[PDB]
Amino acid sequence: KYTSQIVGRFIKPLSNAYHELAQVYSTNNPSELRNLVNKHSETFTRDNNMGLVKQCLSSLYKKNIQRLTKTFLTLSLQDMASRVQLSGPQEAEKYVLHMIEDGEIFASINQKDGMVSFHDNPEKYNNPAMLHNIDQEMLKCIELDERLKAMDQEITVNPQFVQK
Amino acid sequence: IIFKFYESKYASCLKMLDEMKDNLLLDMYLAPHVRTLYTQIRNRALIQYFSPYVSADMHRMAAAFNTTVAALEDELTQLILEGLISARVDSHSKILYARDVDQRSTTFEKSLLMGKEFQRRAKAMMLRAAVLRNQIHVK
Amino acid sequence: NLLEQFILLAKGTSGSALTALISQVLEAPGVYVFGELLELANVQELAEGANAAYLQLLNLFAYGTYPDYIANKESLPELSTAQQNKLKHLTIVSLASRMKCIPYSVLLKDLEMRNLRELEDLIIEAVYTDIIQGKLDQRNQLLEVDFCIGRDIRKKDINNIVKTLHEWCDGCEAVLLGIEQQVLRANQYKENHNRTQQQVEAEVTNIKKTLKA
Amino acid sequence: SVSVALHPLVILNISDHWIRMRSQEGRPVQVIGALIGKQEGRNIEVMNSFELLSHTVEEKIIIDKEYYYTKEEQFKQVFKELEFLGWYTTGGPPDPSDIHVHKQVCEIIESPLFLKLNPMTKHTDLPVSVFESVIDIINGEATMLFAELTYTLATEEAERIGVDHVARMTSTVAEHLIAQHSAIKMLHSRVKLILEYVKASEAGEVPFNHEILREAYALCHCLPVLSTDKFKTDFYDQCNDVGLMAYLGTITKTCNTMNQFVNKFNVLYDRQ
Amino acid sequence: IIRGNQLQEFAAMLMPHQKATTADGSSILDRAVIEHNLLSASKLYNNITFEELGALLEIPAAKAEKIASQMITEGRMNGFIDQIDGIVHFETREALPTWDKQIQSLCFQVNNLLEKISQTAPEWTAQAMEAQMAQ
Amino acid sequence: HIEELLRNIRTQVLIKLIKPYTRIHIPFISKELNIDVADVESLLVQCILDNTIHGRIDQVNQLLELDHQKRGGARYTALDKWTNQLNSLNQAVVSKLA
Amino acid sequence: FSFKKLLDQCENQELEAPGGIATPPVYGQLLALYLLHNDMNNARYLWKRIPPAIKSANSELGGIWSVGQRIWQRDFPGIYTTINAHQWSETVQPIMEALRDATRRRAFALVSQAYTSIIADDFAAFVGLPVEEAVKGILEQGWQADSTTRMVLPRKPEQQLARLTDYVAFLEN
Amino acid sequence: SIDEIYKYDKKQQQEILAAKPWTKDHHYFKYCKISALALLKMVMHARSGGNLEVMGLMLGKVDGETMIIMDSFALPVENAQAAAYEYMAAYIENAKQVGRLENAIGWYHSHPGYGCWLSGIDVSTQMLNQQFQEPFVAVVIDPTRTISAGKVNLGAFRTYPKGYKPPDEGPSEYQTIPLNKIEDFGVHCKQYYALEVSYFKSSLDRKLLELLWNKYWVNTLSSSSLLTNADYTTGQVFDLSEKLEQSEAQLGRGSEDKLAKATRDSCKTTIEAIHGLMSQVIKDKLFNQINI
């Protein structure tokens, strides 16, 4: 909220290609995003941030595959590479394998039936590891509050904060 | 149609609705609202079909709603993504399984996310206080 | 107390009468610990002679288990049904002494039982005799014991008692030390916070008074 | 043979009754009362107790039944679930007077209990003793005798807090870790005494008692307590839930401190 | 649990007017004994199958299921029936209250052992070590 | 009205039947009520929709699971409400500065 | 632990340098050790900032980057093919040989955690061993290797009281 | 002679009642002394009441500026007049002939989960009672906070007469009153004053408690307070969330500084939870970690 009014009035109009890019990356459609990226190639390569847009293109497919897990429980590889537009069971299998390797998704691949099963069980909160994580987060919050209290005590004694 | 909707007989209800839609389209005050209404009605039946079931065979569902299994699967996915159906489709055997959410894990996840966001906001505000106190701006 | 009666009646008897009394004691219901009868010099004199088998059987009942009477069966005399049932009860007690969740497979292997109904009937008998207390879980095939009696002990077993009690005492001492240290730390933290707040207030008041001159 | 559970409130009632009567009359006097409670199956649980009125004729105690029934209706007005259980008195070992009074009481309830408190005692044990009446035939005559029962102390949280507050009678972590200290000290004392006796028996200073050593062996085998996996899962569930509560409380406190600092900063470094 | 032979001898020693039976059958004594057996078996088992319950009550498994369901419906017992698994489950006996009860029993054992040591052998270890610990 | 009377008594008998069980086969209910499996499923669907029977039908294996397993879920609702209030409160407190 | 210390020493030696540019041996060791620890970003940037003159002078950097490029695309057969195509004199040999073992363990863990039924040929390609060796190796692990269809089924793999006192002392102030 | 407090003399009580000094001053009674038995009786009655409110009477005497309470009894209340006074008179008549000579000195009632204070109805009742029968005192017990905090929550109040305006002088320790009872606590807070509460016991009671502790430590060592009060903490969290919402609404605009009060309530609940957890941690260290 505390942002200056320059970005909301003057800086925003110059960044019109990127708002179009977001608007296309608001409706799940890799073809439209590729078309827009190719149309605005000169603008994206003049600002030297080309290769950060191809990451958006390659992340749209990952977002679609993740959205597939919110509805399905077992999806054929050929069926999967038709809602995310991956053009082949092999590309869908390699995408799912890469996603599993990086921890983005919780899934298993069955090459016998050519299926992918979605598990969606990150962790049950009944182990000392989560206790340690909670303790670390609480220690960070305690240090934060201690610093805030130190700053307030240093502002309380200020003579300028005695006449008002 | 109303009685068959109440008595959980959806094939006949939808057949009569589709039969009378063509005649209803010639109305003056109801025609513009026909299509939307129909969609709404159909949607209700779907959540009214899966309400008693914890795992439903999709072939019987498709036969009940007079559609193929693929169109039913697409409609069910559209409903699960946003609507009132909380279920998961097992397309290997074409079975719609009722999904039961876990409350404890959900609360833990939301609380940890809120804590992380609060810490980020607090650090940002401390930096903002430092820059405001030091009178740093671009002119 | 049946064992007290048997001790009193066995003051001077020896020989065949001693063996008859030992058989009666083993077969007598309700007596499951034979440590007072074993320590008699009259009983211990059975080692030298032709009646050492009866003393070995008494030692097996006092300290051993049923599997011990699978490989040393020829030496000891024949056991009746009541004696074998008592030995099975004592084997169940021995198993429950070391672990408090006995799988059905272990009991089936130890007590030499064919089906689960016989084993569960034996466990129910043991519970009714009030030597062990517990419940049977058929789904998990477990016997969960809450309390089992203590069997007889030799002179080389008291070391384990003293070791375990020493460990418990050390644990209690450590707990008390930790409690005291934490109490001291909490009190110190409270005192330090109050002192810091009072110094801050005093400095603020001094600065305020100075500005009003 | 029933199993009896006792509440400290009953003992306090009896002691207060004795103190009041002794102070009022000027000399120690035996008191006679009644007990109420609840019986589930074969387990009796004695909850409360009200005084009873009795007279002495010749040399025998006669219980006023009309007053008893009046007080029974009075307490039934309030404590609906509680029921008459037996009577109590103060003294030493049971005496034929107690037999006569128990015969009188048995006309009210089929199987009453008999509680006796000893206000003048020298030992270090609670002087409460619980008996039940057993009928017997001796020389062809029907007499009754007393069979003692083993009693425990009932577990109630509010009762425990009240009794602790009464027994003691004069930071927050320091206040909390004073109730735990006073119990772990007794546990450590008891374990140390048992260990010293066992070591003395092992080295040899006292006669070899088999019963004590067998009980000690069973006690040693009783540890650890509930080392199953489901218990560990439940324990970690509790720990994680309390950790989340602590995290939320810490966030609330930090938000309050942040608000205070923001207010002070806006007062000093701003003009509004 | 009252087994079959005990009830057989009891019926043998009963006089004929005591054996009250309905016209269709279903002897009152036998039914009461079956109910008592099932209630008492509720205190030994955490859960039991229908076959073993019918073998322990000596009735057909279908009758065992019917009797258990009737008994649970009227509120005589606490439990539930899983028909697909064929398992009747009695009280759960959760973990943390069990831990508290076991702790209480262990401390009771300690107290009783100290009482017995002190009352069967005064002077000696008991009072001398009590004083020494105090000192 | 004989059909309505028959349906009323069948519904009452089924409600009494499902009282102790946790998971119960539908052919079992068909045997008890003396009706085919399809009519038992229709009756169960009507009863569950009318908020009379608290359970759900497993159609693939043809059984009925009764929702008898419940726990103390109010604590997590309270924690969720606390978390949401804390989120909004810290947003407002931070937005107070500038 | 013996490789992390060498990596730190190589990084410091490169940072100090006789004018920014380091010697080709430490450049090659740095690149290979970045490949070991799965620092693909760091290895890519190191290849970006290595002077072209050093690349022309020393041709082993080309082979090391070929191996790194096969690693970057996640091409296990390519990784195993390109590892056994070049060597040095006790400079990259231990690290280039530990790279093979690291890749082996990584592929085995990935197959275990990401599959429920994988063909024997695919498993051998992922690991790099021959098909018969791949099947016969998983014997003590019990992976249930099938015949005819040749399907492999991977198997799915104190201070507390002080902390609580600190928390309370913070909350109660 | 600690037992001398138990000796009751009627002549002195009649003389004091006929020479009432409390009719001149208003802040006269400032000390309340409660017997151990009476306190235990009130605590057990309030706990047996459950989540509802239970009320009873309080027998005792007066001694200078001290209100001494000796016993108690529970009124039926399933009622102000009629049934309550019938029970009071009948119970006093019954108890006068068995050794209980003292008459009523107050009334007690429970405030389960919302502190120890007098509402508007309680203030009106105390005014009515002190108008006719004097002296009098109102004891309020919180049976639920007693378990949660491990401390007996009890408060003996006495109500100022109508038309009297005392000049400030109120310490007013902080009480976590729920949201729906904050308004009632605000209007009627200066119409009564609290008496300092102390407890006493006889010599036989002291000896019996000392002998009882030899076997009562088992229940202390096996309490597990984290499970006995699980709905109280949930209600506290709900009330705290509502208070946080109100404080946030106050922040968006622009009690005094409602955020501080919400923070205090959150701290109290969290500290109680952590105490309950550390007790179980100590038990686990003592008993489960002796793994042989």
Ligand SMILES: CC(C)n1nc(C(F)F)cc1C(=O)Nc1ccc([C@H]2[C@@H](O)CCCc3cncn32)c(-c2ccccc2)c1
């Ligand atoms: C001494 C008693 C009998 N008494 N004497 C006179 C006087 F008229 F003589 C008048 C009275 C008298 O009943 N007061 C009273 C008032 C209100 C309540 C309840 C009432 O609001 C409804 C519940 C909420 C509440 C919170 N706090 C008091 N309440 C009670 C009361 C307390 C506990 C249990 C039952 C009732 C007693």
Ligand SMILES: [Zn+2]
């Ligand atoms: Zn009130």
